[PDB]
Amino acid sequence: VHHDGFQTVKATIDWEHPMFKLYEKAKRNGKWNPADIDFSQDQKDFASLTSEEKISALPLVAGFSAGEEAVTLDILPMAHALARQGRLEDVLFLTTFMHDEAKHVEMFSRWQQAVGIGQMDLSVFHNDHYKRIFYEALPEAMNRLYADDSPEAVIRAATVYNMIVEGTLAESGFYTFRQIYKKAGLFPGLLQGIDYLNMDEGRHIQFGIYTIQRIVNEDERYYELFIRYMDELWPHVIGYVDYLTELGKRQQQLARTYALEIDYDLLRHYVIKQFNLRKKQISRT
């Protein structure tokens, strides 16, 4: 529909808005380019591995590649909803959020291309719980915003996207990469990419917290909805984590060859810790 007028004609950008300040940080801190990462040692590393050692990292990379692609596509309805609400500074920030995710998609795909598994269909490592989150719950909650931008809808979208997918699963995946492959001295280009992704995703979670909290500030009853929506998704989070753990325990050749001690119980507790920590970052009041 039509534009009634424009904020930067009637007035200016709200220079003190928290999302404008986050937009400014994103420009300053967002200059990295996946095209500059040297994957040449990753290629040699991957080639040096046996077939059974090779597959060890792929379930995780499969989860990330799909995840980054999903969040790239599925942030667009949130940007649209906030734009229609006239929240210009949120929109400015979300352009950096979307461009970040584009780079994240690119980073993992560049890695797959470099190590020679670009032609492999990694969908085999998406179990039912993963599909329930990334193929279904995430796009459903986001696409809802095109026809229902109520506070309930916006909280549910930010919960699934920012607090579960990014704030629980992605953060735990970064930790896992460091606990396993950084200890093995493997895939230095991928691990460089992970470090840049982790920095970007700190801003993304701040936007989710800002968005949920500002709606909770309007009516404390929305706090109960946030907790409920978190708890609804937990079975699929831990169902996917348990699936990745089972795969890891059934193919132990990389851990043995590299004399690693992968504590899968420690990884499980980190996911639980992230989930609970995300809940603690929203307050009823």
Binding site for ligand PLM (CB under 6 A): 60, 63-64, 67-68, 71, 101, 104, 165-166, 169-170, 172-173, 176, 201, 204, 241, 244-245, 267, 271
Give the residue carrying structure tokens 């699963």. 169
Give which of a second copy, ligand PLM, Fe ion, none residue 33 binds (C-beta under 5 to 8 Å, depending on kind).
a second copy
| Whether the Cβ atoms of residue 151 and residue 222 lie closer than 8 Å to each other | yes
DSSP single-letter state for residue 36: G
Residue 27, exposed/middle/buried by CB under 10 A (0-12, 13-18, 19+)?
A: exposed
- Closer to a second copy at the Cβ: 101 or 225? 101
Binding flag, residue 104, Mn ion (CB under 5 A): yes
- Closer to ligand PLM at the Cβ: 223 or 271? 271
> What token pair was written down for 210?
């800002």
- Closer to a second copy at the Cβ: 77 or 255? 77
90-97 long-range contacts (CB < 8 A, ≥24 apart) are: 90/19, 90/207, 90/211, 92/13, 92/19, 92/20, 92/23, 93/19, 93/20, 93/22, 93/23, 93/26, 93/207, 94/207, 95/23, 96/23, 96/26, 96/27, 96/30, 96/203, 97/26, 97/203, 97/204, 97/207
| Whether the Cβ atoms of residue 61 and residue 125 lie closer than 8 Å to each other | no
Smallest gap from Cβ 179 to a second copy, in A, equals 23
Q: Is 3 annotated as a binding residue?
A: no
Residue of minimal CB distance from Mn ion?
104
**Counts of helices then strands in the chain (DSSP H, E):** 16, 0
- Closer to a second copy at the Cβ: 26 or 225? 26
Q: What is d(CA 283, CA 267) in angstroms, rounded to the nearest whole number? A: 27
Number of Cβ within 10 Å of residue 231's Cβ equals: 11
Of the ranges 14-22, 26-34, 61-69, 126-134, which one interacts with Mn ion (CB under 5 A)?
Answer: 61-69
List residues near a second copy by CB under 8 A: 1-13, 15, 23-24, 27-28, 31, 33, 35, 62, 65-66, 68-70, 72-73, 76-77, 79-80, 83, 88, 91-92, 95-96, 98-99, 101-103, 105-106, 108-110, 112-113, 118-119, 121-123, 126, 134-136, 139-140, 143, 146
Q: Is 23 annotated as a binding residue?
A: no
Smallest gap from Cβ 37 to Fe ion, in A, equals 18
Q: What is d(CA 181, CA 276) in angstroms, rounded to the nearest whole number? A: 26
Smallest gap from Cβ 210 to Fe ion, in A, equals 14
Q: For binding to Mn ion (CB under 5 A), which residues are involved?
A: 68, 101, 104
Q: Which residues are annotated as a binding site for Fe(2+)?
A: 68, 101, 104, 128-129, 166, 201, 204
Q: Which residues are annotated as a binding site for Fe(3+)?
A: 68, 101, 104, 129, 161, 166, 201, 204
Q: Which residues are annotated as a binding site?
A: 68, 101, 104, 128-129, 161, 166, 201, 204
